[PDB]
């Protein structure tokens, strides 16, 4: 069995709670930084499927990592449903206008045809034939963060309906990513929402996470590194014993600690945000090599 | 169940070269530093078995390590055979006089009764009942280094006889340590000897290493981490440094680190070839217990 086939099996076992204890899988969020491989602008790379798979996979081979990030939280979810997002700079910014229907049923084909989402799905399908079998991870915007983005653009909606809408977008994205070939899914949040929204937020996480597991993909909630949220099976939670399966690191590679030994409680390590795109390709490699003991 | 039973089995598999790849066992050489647990002088600790066993075991549990070092290269072999060794400071120094008989057959009872060796054997027997089953390692002076120590004190003897003698001392010690409960043995050298002595040195390594393996204890040859990459004799488990090129897959081996904890790298990922990590010398005794704990925690990702 290949080394990456083992890591893919470890994620599928994790999705059904049948995991055996092992050293955690290091999945740093890298996107705009990878564009330095071909020296092309990041905002152009993420729009092309074939070019995306070349920069992301070749950077992974240079970094000797067992996983790559086909998608980072970058307003892709807001752009697809009708929110104004900046297209001239990376990372994209949320605008001030929106033409969104939170009550309408999600059109999966329209979702999958959004320029940056369509390119990410095409990249997954192409990486899914890599003989190294890397763990194809997709880091999405969390429901609470997505709810905030919608209201920032000017969407007026109640808490129950807007979190149901956000949960339906992520549940549809989970199926589309998993059917393309994604092995690991994560929801990135900036903070735990207000108590009045906490319940709707947990239900949106459960809805999307339940389809993820149905496709043998483990769903991870990632909160910034600097009681637990869910409790039905054994989900991977973040921040503050209990048997949580994820660990959050900061995005700055110089500040990463060593990779932990087998006995630690996590079986996965993610960065709370994408590795700074300005960071040089050589310095990122040097810090990844440091972290692995090379 | 028993965390240390798996590590002890991994060492026994290493002794017959049949190990399956796993994350390396971290065995730093720690001796005089551990004496700060009870705040007793290092030279006194190494002369009482129980005092040695509790200071080492409590530091071992404090650092969360799966192994401890009951013996460190510290002139114990030269002291036992008749070399003048300093008794007033740690680490001991080789003197300028010696009353040694290189030709005589080794007296195991006299060897095992040398104050610091008897206490190390006394500590091993007591650690052998620890329910955590740690890997009890014993780091000895290498044959070439022991040969040099004898000639530094004033022993006049030929290469063949003096390396045969050094090999008989280490072969007898290997049995005494293994029967006491040692799970890992290492021979620490400062450099590869001259070509003129290379064969005698390899034969002394084979003599001692062959009894070690017979007791299911792997014998590891440790050369300084700062030395450049070079040949590794078949008579012992190789222990290259982190910057040294990989060895052929038919040779299972260990990794050598420097003694300074601040300079240690991270512990490597699962896929690495080494089954074991040792320091080329004991961790500087002056280093504080609190700073050592922080460096071990850094190395493990805590």
UniProtKB/Swiss-Prot annotation, chain A:
One of its GO terms (molecular function) is ligase activity. It is an enzyme of class 6 (ligase). GO terms for cellular component: cytoplasm. The keyword Cytoplasm applies. InterPro entries: ApcE. It catalyses: acetophenone + hydrogencarbonate + 2 ATP + H2O = 3-oxo-3-phenylpropanoate + 2 ADP + 2 phosphate + 2 H(+). Inhibited by zinc ions, carbamoylphosphate and beta,gamma-imido-ATP. Its main location: cytoplasm. The keyword Nucleotide-binding applies. Divalent metal cations. Magnesium or manganese are required for activity. Its EC number is 6.4.1.8. It is found in: Cytoplasm. Catalyzes the carboxylation of acetophenone to form 3-oxo-3-phenylpropanoate (benzoylacetate) in the anaerobic catabolism of ethylbenzene. Also carboxylates propiophenone at the same rate and 4-acetyl-pyridine at lower rates. NCBIfam families: AcphenoCarb_ApcE. Acetophenone carboxylase consists of five subunits; a heterooctameric subcomplex of two alpha (Apc1), two beta (Apc2), two gamma (Apc3) and two delta (Apc4) subunits assembles with the epsilon (Apc5) subunit in an unknown stoichiometry. The epsilon subunit dissociates during enzyme purification. However, Apc5 is required for acetophenone carboxylation and the enzyme complex is reconstituted using recombinant Apc5. This is Acetophenone carboxylase epsilon subunit.
From Swiss-Prot, chain B:
Inhibited by zinc ions, carbamoylphosphate and beta,gamma-imido-ATP. NCBIfam families: AcphenoCarb_ApcE. Acetophenone carboxylase consists of five subunits; a heterooctameric subcomplex of two alpha (Apc1), two beta (Apc2), two gamma (Apc3) and two delta (Apc4) subunits assembles with the epsilon (Apc5) subunit in an unknown stoichiometry. Induction: By ethylbenzene, toluene and acetophenone. The keyword Ligase applies. Its cofactor is Mg(2+); Mn(2+). It comes from Aromatoleum aromaticum (strain DSM 19018 / LMG 30748 / EbN1) (Azoarcus sp. (strain EbN1)). The gene is apc5. Keywords: ATP-binding, Cytoplasm, Ligase, Nucleotide-binding. It is an enzyme of class 6 (ligase). Its EC number is 6.4.1.8. It comes from the Bacteria. Signal peptide: none annotated. This is Acetophenone carboxylase epsilon subunit. Divalent metal cations. Magnesium or manganese are required for activity.
